[PDB]
């Protein structure tokens, strides 16, 4: 790795026109209002640590015939905010996890009545020897998983 792996850039579509870069060296990358979060985004609607991205080693079930993408790394997006975050088309409730693909647009906060719309664009610039970068490609087609004691533990020491 050169230093940066994933790029979360609060796009103009969102009230925020900034760019965030998740250093492959930092796992997991926390985002939210509180500076404690690797990423700094303060939106009264979201919690201190609205959500955080975590990278994990991608491993298939079996490979005694077919040749998959080997056991590399996959970047996951973890959500801990109450307002809920939305990844493209998958819902992200407090304690959820979803795979992030190069060019993944995640919604941190959306309000129809308040017109409060936030969202960052995930762009993988560097691939630290990844199976691809983070496009999933497995049993379930782009599905939002739930967080476990492992993920919750990462934020516990935030």
């Amino acid at each position: 790795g050169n230093g940066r792996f994933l790029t979360l850039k609060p796009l103009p579509d969102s009230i925020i026109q900034e760019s965030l870069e998740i250093q492959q060296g930092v796992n997991p990358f926390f985002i939210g209002r509180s500076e404690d979060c690797n990423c700094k985004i303060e939106d009264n609607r979201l919690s201190r640590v609205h959500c955080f991205i975590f990278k994990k080693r991608h491993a298939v079930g079996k490979s005694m015939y077919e040749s998959p993408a080997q056991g590399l790394d996959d970047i996951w997006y973890c959500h801990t905010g109450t307002n809920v975050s939305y990844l493209n088309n998958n819902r992200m409730i407090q304690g959820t996890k979803f795979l992030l693909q190069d060019g993944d647009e995640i919604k941190i906060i959306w309000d129809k009545n308040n017109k409060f719309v936030i969202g960052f664009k995930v762009e993988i610039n560097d691939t630290t020897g990844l199976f691809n970068e983070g496009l999933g490609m497995l049993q379930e087609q782009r599905v939002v998983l739930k967080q476990t004691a492992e993920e919750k533990d990462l934020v516990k020491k935030l």
Binding site: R45, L46, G81, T82, N83, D111, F116
Partner: peptide, 9 residues
């Protein structure tokens, strides 16, 4: 002290 998440309706 600003500990309050403006949860939307």
């Amino acid at each position: 002290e600003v500990e309050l998440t403006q949860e939307l309706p």
